[PDB]
Amino acid sequence: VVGGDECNINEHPFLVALYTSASSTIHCAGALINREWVLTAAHCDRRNIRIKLGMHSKNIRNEDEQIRVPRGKYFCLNTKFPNGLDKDIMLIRLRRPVTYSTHIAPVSLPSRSRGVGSRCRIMGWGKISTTTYPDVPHCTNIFIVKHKWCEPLYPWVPADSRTLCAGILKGGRDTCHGDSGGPLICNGEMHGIVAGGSEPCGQHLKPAVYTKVFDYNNWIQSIIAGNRTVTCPP
Numbered sequence: 001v002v003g004g005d006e007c008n009i010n011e012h013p014f015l016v017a018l019y020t021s022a023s024s025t026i027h028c029a030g031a032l033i034n035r036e037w038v039l040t041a042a043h044c045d046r047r048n049i050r051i052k053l054g055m056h057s058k059n060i061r062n063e064d065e066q067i068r069v070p071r072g073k074y075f076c077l078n079t080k081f082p083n084g085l086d087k088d089i090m091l092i093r094l095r096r097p098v099t100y101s102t103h104i105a106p107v108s109l110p111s112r113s114r115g116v117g118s119r120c121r122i123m124g125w126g127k128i129s130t131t132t133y134p135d136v137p138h139c140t141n142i143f144i145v146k147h148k149w150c151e152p153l154y155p156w157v158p159a160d161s162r163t164l165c166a167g168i169l170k171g172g173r174d175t176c177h178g179d180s181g182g183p184l185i186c187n188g189e190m191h192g193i194v195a196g197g198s199e200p201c202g203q204h205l206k207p208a209v210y211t212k213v214f215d216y217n218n219w220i221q222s223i224i225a226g227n228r229t230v231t232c233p234p
């Protein structure tokens, strides 16, 4: 995240970090939905995913920090692109649940749709400057802007994409490499999943793309309930 500062240690209990059994590098983030489910971006998937919960600094572990592996991973199977990037979302079921604590808590799904003008907060362990990754997650506030700003830049995100375009038109604040899969928080609810932006991040007139969670609420709840034939919103 560029244009922000280290997050308050207690403000991101739902934030999880994703890495692999082969690399300790945080390639993406995710959000805890309940005691055994994490919501993230589909492109964040990897063969041997490892999830860190309750973490702030990568070098000073919180008392309640936990590590988990998936017992199940679920995707949208009715996508426009074969690589599935038009519906960049995935559910990960933890092999073993976690218990809530100061640094581990669930984030609520959106109770209603929110759009242009909404002030939201982004967070992650992604780049904070040219080739610079922090040891602690960074946070900053951005705005959901007219979806038209994104459509041209990412011609694979059409006008009807179930996505939110967000950032600061003047530039300076944006999600970056390593932040994908993280939550976009608006009014205390997770309204988006970081999907991707332009490189370098934070450029003038180049907001980023966030998967619009609200549209996937029913799919998410059905999957968590155990349904395995439910499809993602068309």
Ligand SMILES: *[C@@H]1O[C@H](CO)[C@@H](O)[C@H](O)[C@H]1NC(C)=O
Residues within 6 Å of the ligand: 222, 226, 227, 228, 229, 230, 231
């Ligand atoms: C799964 O969800 C679909 C869509 O809501 C529904 O039609 C179907 O009956 C459900 N199946 C189960 C396991 O109840």
